[PDB]
Design a binder for this molecule. Structure first.
Ligand SMILES: COC(=O)c1[nH]nc2c1CCCC2
Lengths: 300, 237
């Protein structure tokens, strides 16, 4: 189990660590989070008390370095930092643990929620979506735009999700206009899976990451990306059986985890009704359809 | 975007544009089977593609063979339309290709947009006008060429005959739609109006009689009365 220590907490802030979250009061004696499960990526996130504008945060993997959080009063945010001095980092952290100034990552032993939400997400791939190569962790916030949004403005601060457009020359074979538009299998399997993602684990990783950024940062472009990636599978008549089974589980846990009160904005009614009730895969998402109907029947 | 009564004069500016109407692409008769079930029998059809400024009609004839062994024909028909339209654009020299294609039904938007992804500069738009182009098969010469086709075929017409020599395209188009609207509301009466007189003939190379300006006024008035009449007979007014 690893630690993300904090220099101090000089402004009042709601802190998130994966699906959990707690309030720190201005200048409270908080020195960070302990007992973080090794083996998964993680995200540590921020919403200032005084300005709920800009949720922001950092994706990281404790295997990839020693990371701490330091408030920057010039730029006005809690910044993630790496300490290359391993020994010095251990000496400081051990002082904090002996003074119990850390919140414990509160994992329940029955609970696989974080694992199920991040099964296919890997730091190396996050870092290609979020281009900032000098750091081993990735900053995201609510306002960041995606490459596709930048085509419909700063390239350095963008989310480079894979571009998906059903009315594009990539998606439609010359001479198969009707077939390719009404059945997206060509686009799903040959263009995206075989050609771009290489395998369904990379496709599912981007999908899961898109979803987590939509949920934690209210990042609109990520929400668009999550839904597009779902719609491309559900609108393909030919999907490997194992992909649909895994997708049903992915979505199930993502619907389970969504805050009930953010449903109206994070869930596209058209895409979900189409996917669950009209599409080629309408009968293939038994777990997802069952939770959607019992938890958000208004949307349908 | 869409096309309504605010930007009506845009039809007659000098940006090439075409209407596309697909309401006669797939035509059937419905009949009883020996077993007392119901079945369809398709008949020839056509795509109505029309430059409103010049009157050039590009009449693509849809021979029933094109449906043999196919399923979901109402849906295939929109895609076949879009494909024939794209094929047409690709056959015109660049300076003849449209800047805009306006479809009369919004269900054609996606099929045509997908087929024209190669032509990103051609705008595909809907319209809020209820245009009566379905009545195109009430023009005898166009009906005749469609029903006699034994194979796919494109026949070119000028739907305004020689009118543009005497009137503006704005006025020719408005005559055309009055004519079509009437033919669509009561084909018999409308056809009675156009052709009971011998003195007035349809030239071999035209679709409509050779009316003088004064006789067109009389015709136009009679068609307005027809439309108003049927509107009463319909709504009991
Ligand atoms: C200025 O602080 C550092 O460079 C540093 N290195 N490791 C830690 C810190 C801050 C205190 C938490 C852990």
């Amino acid at each position: 189990m690893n630690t993300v220590p904090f220099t101090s907490a000089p402004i009042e802030v709601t802190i998130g660590i994966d699906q959990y979250s707690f309030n720190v009061k201005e200048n409270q004696p908080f020195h960070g989070i302990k007992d973080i499960p090794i083996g998964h990526v993680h995200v540590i996130h921020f919403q200032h008390a005084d300005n709920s504008s800009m949720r922001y945060g950092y994706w990281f993997d404790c295997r990839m370095g020693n990371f701490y959080i330091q408030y920057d009063p010039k730029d006005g945010l809690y910044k993630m930092m790496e300490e290359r001095d391993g020994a010095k980092f251990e000496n400081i952290v051990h002082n904090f643990k002996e003074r119990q100034m850390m919140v414990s990552y509160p994992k329940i032993d029955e609970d696989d929620t974080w694992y199920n939400l991040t099964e296919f997400v890997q730091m190396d791939k996050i870092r290609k979506i979020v281009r900032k190569d000098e750091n081993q962790f990735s900053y995201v916030d609510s306002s960041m735009t995606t490459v596709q949004e930048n085509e419909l403005s700063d390239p350095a601060h963008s989310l480079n999700y894979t571009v998906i457009n059903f009315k594009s020359r990539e998606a439609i074979r010359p001479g198969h206009e009707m077939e390719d538009f009404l059945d997206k299998s060509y686009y799903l399997n040959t263009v995206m899976l075989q050609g771009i993602f290489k395998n369904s684990s990379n496709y599912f990783g981007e999908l899961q990451f898109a979803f987590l950024n939509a949920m934690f940062f209210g990042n609109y472009g990520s929400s668009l990306q999550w839904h597009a990636m779902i719609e491309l599978i559900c609108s393909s008549a030919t999907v490997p059986k194992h992909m649909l089974d895994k997708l049903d589980e992915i979505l199930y846990y993502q619907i389970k985890t969504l805050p009930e009160q953010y449903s109206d904005i994070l869930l596209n009614e058209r895409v979900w009704n189409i996917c669950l009730y009209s599409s080629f895969q309408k009968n293939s998402l038994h777990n997802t359809e069952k939770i959607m109907e019992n938890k958000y029947p208004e949307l349908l | 975007g869409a096309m309504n009564s605010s930007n009506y004069a845009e039809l007659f500016n000098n940006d090439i544009k075409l209407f596309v109407d697909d309401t006669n692409v797939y035509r059937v008769t419905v009949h009883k089977t020996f077993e007392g079930n119901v079945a369809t029998k398709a008949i020839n059809g056509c795509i109505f593609t029309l430059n409103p400024k010049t009157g050039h009609l590009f009449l693509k004839i849809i021979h029933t063979s094109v449906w043999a062994g196919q399923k979901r024909l109402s849906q295939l028909a929109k895609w076949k339309t879009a494909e024939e339209v794209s094929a047409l654009v690709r056959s015109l020299p660049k300076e003849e290709q449209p800047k805009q294609i306006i479809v009369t039904r919004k269900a054609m938007l996606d099929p045509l947009e997908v087929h024209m992804l190669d032509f990103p500069n051609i705008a595909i738009r809907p319209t809020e006008l209820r245009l009566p182009f379905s009545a195109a098969m009430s023009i005898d010469k166009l009906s005749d060429v469609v029903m006699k086709a034994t194979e796919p075929q494109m026949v070119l017409f000028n739907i305004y005959d020689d009118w543009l020599d005497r009137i503006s395209s704005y006025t020719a188009f408005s005559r055309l739609t009055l004519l079509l609207r009437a033919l669509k509301t009561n084909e018999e009466s409308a056809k009675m109006i156009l052709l009971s007189d011998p003195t007035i003939t349809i030239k071999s190379y035209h679709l409509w009689p050779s009316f003088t300006d004064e006789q067109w006024i009389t015709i136009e008035s009679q068609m307005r009365d027809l439309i108003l009449t049927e509107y009463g007979r319909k709504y009991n007014v």
